[PDB]
Amino acid sequence: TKELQEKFWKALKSDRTVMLGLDGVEDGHARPMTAQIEGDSGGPIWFFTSKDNALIAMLGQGRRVIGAFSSKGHDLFASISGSLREDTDPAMVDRLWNPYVAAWYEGGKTDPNLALLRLDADHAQIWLNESSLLAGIKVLL
Amino acid sequence: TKELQEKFWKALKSDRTVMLGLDGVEDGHARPMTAQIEGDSGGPIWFFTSKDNALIAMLGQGRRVIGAFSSKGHDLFASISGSLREDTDPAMVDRLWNPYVAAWYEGGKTDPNLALLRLDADHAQIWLNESSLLAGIKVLLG
Amino acid sequence: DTKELQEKFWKALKSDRTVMLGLDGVEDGHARPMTAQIEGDSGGPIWFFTSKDNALIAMLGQGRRVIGAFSSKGHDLFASISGSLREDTDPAMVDRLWNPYVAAWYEGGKTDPNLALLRLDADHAQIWLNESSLLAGIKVLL
Amino acid sequence: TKELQEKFWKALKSDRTVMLGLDGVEDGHARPMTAQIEGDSGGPIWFFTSKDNALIAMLGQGRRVIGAFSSKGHDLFASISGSLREDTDPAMVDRLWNPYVAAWYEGGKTDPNLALLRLDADHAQIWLNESSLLAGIKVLL
Numbered sequence: 013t014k015e016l017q018e019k020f021w022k023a024l025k026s027d028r029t030v031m032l033g034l035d036g037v038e039d040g041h042a043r044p045m046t047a048q049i050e051g052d053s054g055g056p057i058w059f060f061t062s063k064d065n066a067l068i069a070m071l072g073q074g075r076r077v078i079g080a081f082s083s084k085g086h087d088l089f090a091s092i093s094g095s096l097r098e099d100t101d102p103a104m105v106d107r108l109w110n111p112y113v114a115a116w117y118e119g120g121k122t123d124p125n126l127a128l129l130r131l132d133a134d135h136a137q138i139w140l141n142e143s144s145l146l147a148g149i150k151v152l153l
Numbered sequence: 154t155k156e157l158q159e160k161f162w163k164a165l166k167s168d169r170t171v172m173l174g175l176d177g178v179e180d181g182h183a184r185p186m187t188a189q190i191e192g193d194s195g196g197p198i199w200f201f202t203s204k205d206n207a208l209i210a211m212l213g214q215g216r217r218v219i220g221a222f223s224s225k226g227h228d229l230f231a232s233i234s235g236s237l238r239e240d241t242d243p244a245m246v247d248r249l250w251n252p253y254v255a256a257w258y259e260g261g262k263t264d265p266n267l268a269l270l271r272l273d274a275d276h277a278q279i280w281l282n283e284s285s286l287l288a289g290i291k292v293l294l295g
Numbered sequence: 296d297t298k299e300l301q302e303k304f305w306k307a308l309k310s311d312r313t314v315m316l317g318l319d320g321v322e323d324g325h326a327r328p329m330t331a332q333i334e335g336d337s338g339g340p341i342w343f344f345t346s347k348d349n350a351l352i353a354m355l356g357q358g359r360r361v362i363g364a365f366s367s368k369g370h371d372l373f374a375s376i377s378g379s380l381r382e383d384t385d386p387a388m389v390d391r392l393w394n395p396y397v398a399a400w401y402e403g404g405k406t407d408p409n410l411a412l413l414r415l416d417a418d419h420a421q422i423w424l425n426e427s428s429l430l431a432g433i434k435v436l437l
Numbered sequence: 438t439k440e441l442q443e444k445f446w447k448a449l450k451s452d453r454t455v456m457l458g459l460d461g462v463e464d465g466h467a468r469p470m471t472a473q474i475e476g477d478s479g480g481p482i483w484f485f486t487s488k489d490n491a492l493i494a495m496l497g498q499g500r501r502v503i504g505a506f507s508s509k510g511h512d513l514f515a516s517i518s519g520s521l522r523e524d525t526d527p528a529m530v531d532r533l534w535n536p537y538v539a540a541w542y543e544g545g546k547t548d549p550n551l552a553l554l555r556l557d558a559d560h561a562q563i564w565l566n567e568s569s570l571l572a573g574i575k576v577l578l
Contacts, residue, residue: 017435019451026447027510029282031221031230035176041278042221043573044230055437078181080172080221084510085452086369087427089172091182094437133437137182143371143427145469151301153339153378153417158576167310168369185429196578225368226311226511228568233578280573284512284566286328292441294519294558295479315505315514319460325516325562326505362465364456364505373456375466421466425454 016138020090021053023083030057030092031080032131037067042080047131048108055094058104059129060113068127071097079131087141094133104128157279161231162194164224171198171233172221173272175208183221184208188272189249196235198272199245201254209268212238220272228283235274245269300422304374305337307367314363314376316343316415321354326364331415332392339378341415342388344397352411355381363415371426378417388412441563445515446478448508455504455517457484457556462495467505472556473533480519482556483529485538493552496522504556512566519558529553 024030024047033042048058057079061068079092105121105128117123165171165188174183189199198220202209215238222231246262246269258264308314308331317326332342341363345352358381365374389405389412401407449455449472458467473483486492499522506515530546530553542548 013433013435016433017437020435022447022451026444026451027227029223029227029230031172031223031232033219033221033232039234040217040219041232041234041573042219043232043278044223044280044282044570046570076181078174078183080174080183082170082172082185082223082227084225084227084512085508086168086170086223086225087509089170089185089429091172091174091184092437093180093182135434135437137184137432137434139185139432140430141427142430143425145471146424146426148373148375148421148423148468149297149300150419150421151297151304152419153301153376154574154576157574158578161576161578163310167306184432230573232573235578274578276575276578278573278575281571282568284568286514287565287567289325289327289514289516289562289564290438290441291560291562292438292445293560294442294517311511313507313511313514315507315516317503317505317516323518324501324503325518326503327516327562328507328514328564360465362458362467364458364467366454366456366469366507366511368509368511370452370454370507370509373454373469375456375458375468377464377466421468423469425469 018053019088019140020136020138023088024081025049025052027084032077032096034067034070034075034077037070050107055131055133057131057133058108059131060116061127061129062125063127064125065127068098073097077131087143089139091137092131092133093135094131096129096131098127099130100126100128159194160229161277161279164229165222165231166190166193168225170222173218173237175211175216175218178211179207191248196272196274198274199249200270200272201249201257202268202270204266204268206268209239214238218272226284228281230280230282231277233272233274233277235272237270237272239268240271241267241269300424302337303372303424304420304422305333307372308365309333309336311367314365316361316363316380318351318354318359318361321351334391339415339417341417342392343413343415344392344400345411345413347409347411349411352382357381361415369427371424373423373425375421376415376417377419378415380413380415382411383414384410384412443478444513444565445561445563448513449506450474450477452509455482455506457502457504459492459495459500459502459521462492475532480556480558482558483533484554484556485533485541486552486554488550488552490552493523498522502556512568514564516562517556517558518560519556521554521556523552524555525551525553
């Protein structure tokens with residue numbers, strides 16, 4: 013079970029996107045948001061966001077959510093269960109800042125409309141797609 | 154946009170996998186299921202499954218679901234809104250049957266464990282995420 | 296069936312597009328990604344829009360033997376494509392293959408003097424299927 | 438540029454397949470082979486293969502080769518330049534051996550037909566696919 017955790021975190025780290033939907037918000041639509049973590053593994057999972065986000069209004073102390081994740085190549089799928097809440101911690105913003113994130117905010121870090129979500133993931137259900145290479149056939153074309 | 158729909162249906166047909174969860178079932182977890190459609194576009198969206206699928210007991214006459222879909226390469230994300238119910242129609246099993254589906258059922262089409270779900274999708278929110286190639290950089294390897 | 300393979304490969308190439316094409320004696324033989332285009336659902340030749348200043352263009356002469364490396368998104372198909380590569384900037388062909396994505400790369404559009412078009416007439420490919428089967432899902436502490 | 442190396446080595450480690458060709462062999466066809474490295478970064482790059490592989494007859498003391506590489510999701514393309522030679526080192530077989538390697542040998546680690554290649558890559562030309570995420574649009578369907 014060590015390897016499964018590893019594959020998931022590596023995939024999440026490089027591919028990033030998580031489709032995050034909340035039942036009573038935005039009709040339950042699973043919005044693609046680019047995840048970020050500190051280091052190569054372990055939660056929490058962070059999301060840069062705008063104070064005006066409708067999920068921002070309705071998370072409060074915490075909300076149970078399911079995030080849908082797939083690796084770009086579709087060789088892994090993860091259903092991520094956890095609590096999502098706003099945590100616009102300025103130290104966190106410093107740790108996670110980069111030119112890509114930077115582009116989204118006219119204000120830069122100080123931008124009043126910048127928000128940060130954290131997802132505390134306690135568990136995920138994970139599906140590996142296993143592929144078998146078959147013998148290559150020469151075909152005239 | 155008709156391009157958006159066309160792209161969505163194209164990607165769904167070739168890439169197939171949709172992650173599907175139900176509130177109040179298995180903590181809401183979204184399961185990867187492979188989608189099938191008759192023709193090259195237009196719902197409903199069908200999923201072959203097993204009668205002992207947890208979701209089946211809770212569908213009743215049809216429940217609202219959100220399907221999470223991404224294309225391979227992730228150049229398209231779709232959140233598909235619609236209604237999901239078991240419609241294990243023999244006519245439908247026959248129209249959609251293929252060697253890949255066959256592999257899963259020991260009993261063939263007659264398999265007592267075979268179930269079929271349909272998703273009637275009234276709408277999808279679609280995000281394009283298309284890639285553009287940067288210039289190649291030469292890099293020394295250690 | 297050998298018919299299955301050709302069909303899957305043409306489908307993958309049509310949708311995935313990218314082929315990494317290298318040439319001996321050019322740029323150390325490195326294989327650059329270039330996006331393939333074919334008229335219709337299947338069958339060559341394979342067209343590559345490119346720039347006139349491509350050094351690759353300089354070295355083609357009447358046509359050259361090239362090996363193209365292809366993989367499908369998700370890596371369920373690999374193809375090594377053997378064929379002759381030469382420039383064929385046919386104005387009629389430019390129109391048949393033109394689109395906004397192609398258009399974006401050229402200042403003058405079709406009018407651009409730097410616009411070049413390469414054709415790959417492929418006699419044969421080696422094709423590897425690498426299909427995937429989904430494993431049962433495990434739940435992990437996190 | 439450090440980032441590029443990290444991305445490449447990450448992609449290589451998780452995705453593995455390199456399509457490798459040699460001029461004068463198999464008409465120059467690039468056969469997909471699964472790359473292995475010790476650790477998470479740095480060459481050499483190892484390939485398990487067959488003693489009867491036509492490639493082995495032609496490698497001699499070593500040959501310059503180009504390997505075509507893409508990540509499964511096609512967000513990274515790499516043309517790898519290096520020297521390729523057989524180095525069926527027994528220690529190396531133990532070090533890189535695994536259930537997936539194990540699937541190919543009727544005789545296992547001690548299969549007489551087992552052969553190991555090493556690619557000593559000095560450099561690679563690397564292309565990144567930059568994705569741009571548009572605003573979500575609802576469609577009727």
